[PDB]
Design a protein around this ligand. Structure first.
Ligand code: MG
Ligand code: MG
Ligand code: MG
Length: 176
RNA sequence: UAGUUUGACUGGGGCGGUCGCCUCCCAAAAUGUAACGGAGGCGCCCAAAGGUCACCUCAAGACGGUUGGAAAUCGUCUGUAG
């Protein structure tokens, strides 16, 4: 908790020194961290989908919500109004913890050349994150969770400039 | 054996089709207006698809992304409505 706030307060002068803003509020900040499970790659019965909501909830200390299918009957087993993937917003203390879970000791570090190769491009916030697999926890035991879905995790931050995206990882404990 | 019934429109009768209600064009910028003229629906539904109170905003595109990738799902930008 206090460590994430200290890294925020160390980043903000670091950005005012690499790029002076008139205001600390002009500095980039991190708004929310979202994690989107998408069990439409493995649509199931209530059993498996509630189990995946169960595992994200155990990871989060939050209740995940189900995103529900849009009107879009299609070739690909698509229907009308049915679940098609969990979603979890995080703001406040529940958010920063996860990032401090990920920057520091709670990182699985199961695989890492560097950080995921940069994707925001335009440099305003939206830093999308792909976890190809969830063999990345001590929360699971692999023989029982022999299924391994992936995860999407989008970082949302203010940033009116492209290069300023470099601030949200380099000084934020993320490899670049 | 007996008393009867056996529909109409119909560019002649028959055959085919049609017979009630709703929508559009025809319909000539009022209302109305024919055709066996051009198109298509209804003979139901909903214990909530009502009353009320309160709250949300939709398509679609592009950039980015986990088993998905032309289109699952999340994320930003545009977005009097497509
Ligand atoms: Mg006659
Ligand atoms: Mg008239
Ligand atoms: Mg007349």
């Amino acid at each position: 908790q206090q460590l994430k706030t200290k890294y925020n307060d160390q980043v903000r002068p670091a950005l005012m020194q690499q790029f002076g803003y008139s205001s600390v509020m002009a500095v980039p900040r991190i708004e929310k961290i979202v994690v989107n499970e998408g069990l439409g790659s493995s649509k199931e019965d209530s059993k498996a989908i509630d189990k995946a909501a169960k595992e994200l909830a155990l990871i989060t200390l939050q209740k995940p919500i189900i995103t529900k299918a849009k009107k879009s009957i299609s070739n690909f087993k698509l229907r009308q109004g049915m679940p098609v993937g969990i979603k979890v917003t995080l703001r406040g203390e529940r958010m920063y913890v996860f990032l401090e879970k990920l920057i520091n000791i709670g990182l699985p570090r199961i695989r890492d050349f560097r950080g995921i190769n940069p994707n925001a491009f335009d440099g305003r916030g939206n830093y999308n994150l792909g976890i190809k697999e969830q063999l990345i926890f001590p929360e699971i035991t692999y023989d029982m969770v022999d299924k391994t879905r992936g995860m999407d995790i989008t970082i949302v931050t203010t940033a009116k400039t492209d290069e300023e995206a470099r601030a949200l990882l380099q000084s934020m404990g993320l490899p670049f």
